[PDB]
Structures are given as C-alpha cells and as structure tokens.
Design a protein around this ligand. Structure first.
Ligand code: HEM
Length: 180
C-alpha cells in the first residue's frame, strides 16, 4: 500500500481558516479494504511561526474505544501541508509515548473555508506507508459540508458517495480533550 501521490496543498489558502476552531470528520475515504473498523475523528490544529501542534482524537466505532495523540510538525514551504511526529497520550494528555523519528503523518489541506475543509492524511512508519485517508471536516458535529468543499472532493478526482459518512456510526467525541 502506497499513500495517494497526487497530493499537494491548495495554493492561496488562508491559514487562519484552517487553524481555527476544531474539526470533526463528517466523511472519510480509507483506501485499505483490510481496515474493516470504522472511525470517527476530531482534532484541533494550531500554528505558530510555522510549527503546527494539534490534539488528535480517534473513536473506533465498532469497538467503541477512543485513542489520543498530539502531533507536532513544520509547515512546508508549499503551503498548508506538514509532516508531524506525534506523542501518544491518555485522555488527560499524560504522555504514554513521546514522539519518535520513525513514526509520522503527513497532512495536506486541499480546501478550507469558513465552515469546512478537505484534508489528506498519510500515516507512515519507517519506509512503510501505513494508512491513507481523505477526510471532509466541519466545525460542528454532523454539520453539512460546504459546497466549495464538496467541489474540492470532485476536484481531487474522488466521489463523495464513496466516502464513509460518520453520522451513522454512533460517534462519541471527547470535546474536553480537543479544547485547547
Ligand atoms: C475518520 C477519519 C479517520 C479514520 C477513519 C482514521 C483511521 C485510522 C486507523 C484505522 C488507524 C490505525 C489504528 C490502529 O490500528 O492503531 C489510524 C491511526 C492513525 N491516524 Fe487516523 N483516521 C482518521 C483521521 C485521522 C486524522 C484527522 C489524523 C491527523 C490529523 C489521523 C492521524 C493518525 C495517526 C497519527 C495514526 C497512528 C496512531 C497510532 O499509531 O497510535 N487520522 N487512523
């Protein structure tokens, strides 16, 4: 499995629109058929002087379990795109594993407006691409994605109907974790 290659950030994006509020994933497209569990995700990205920090949450909708991470990376010279190393943490942000040199993710912002975003995430370990996920985001749980972001899906060469919608998954969020 190789992460999707036709990936670079949309030029002209206002970073203040992306690094704002919090995001909830309303739709995701995970390329790997062997990932049968479905997830919900929410995260709160912030940037200062080209360094991105973000508290990240996953909910496994089948097992009904949640896991927590803090990513830290540098903005690329290309725009709204960054490769993050990450801590693994508990719900209180106590560190279980510090960031390391072999585990990372690369997030690329493909569209972002006042209400909504389309981002791509490649999770890697060493020489290996572990996960490839496109996510449509909104600022509130089950809010409708913007027309501009729906266009961006099509612009990315994708079909929104092929994504998994998170509304029907029985998502549970931890809004205290993502606040900050
Ligand atoms: C609903 C959208 C998403 C789904 C379906 C999804 C799916 C997954 C799955 C299946 C795993 C592997 C879990 C395991 O077996 O340990 C995972 C891990 C991971 N995801 Fe996501 N993900 C989502 C959103 C995101 C977001 C938005 C980010 C970053 C902003 C992200 C970053 C990561 C990272 C860093 C890992 C590795 C965590 C670890 O190894 O402990 N994912 N994701």
């Amino acid at each position: 499995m190789d992460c999707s290659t036709n990936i670079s950030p949309k030029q002209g994006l206002d970073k203040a629109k992306y690094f704002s509020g919090k995001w909830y994933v309303t739709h995701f497209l995970d390329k790997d058929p062997q990932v049968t569990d479905q997830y919900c995700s929410s995260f709160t990205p912030r940037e200062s002087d080209g360094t991105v920090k973000e508290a990240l949450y996953h909910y496994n909708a089948n097992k009904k379990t949640s896991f927590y991470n803090i990513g830290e990376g540098k903005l690329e010279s290309s725009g709204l795109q960054y490769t993050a190393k990450y801590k693994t943490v508990d719900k209180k942000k106590a560190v279980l594993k510090e960031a390391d040199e072999k585990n990372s993710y690369t997030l690329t912002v493909l569209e972002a407006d006042d209400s909504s975003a389309l981002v791509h995430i490649c999770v890697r370990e060493g020489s290996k691409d572990l996960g490839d996920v496109y996510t449509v985001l909104t600022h509130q749980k089950d809010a409708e994605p913007s027309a501009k972001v729906k266009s961006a899906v099509t612009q990315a060469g994708l079909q929104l109907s092929q994504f998994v919608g998170t509304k029907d998954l029985g998502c549970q969020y931890d809004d205290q974790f993502t606040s900050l």
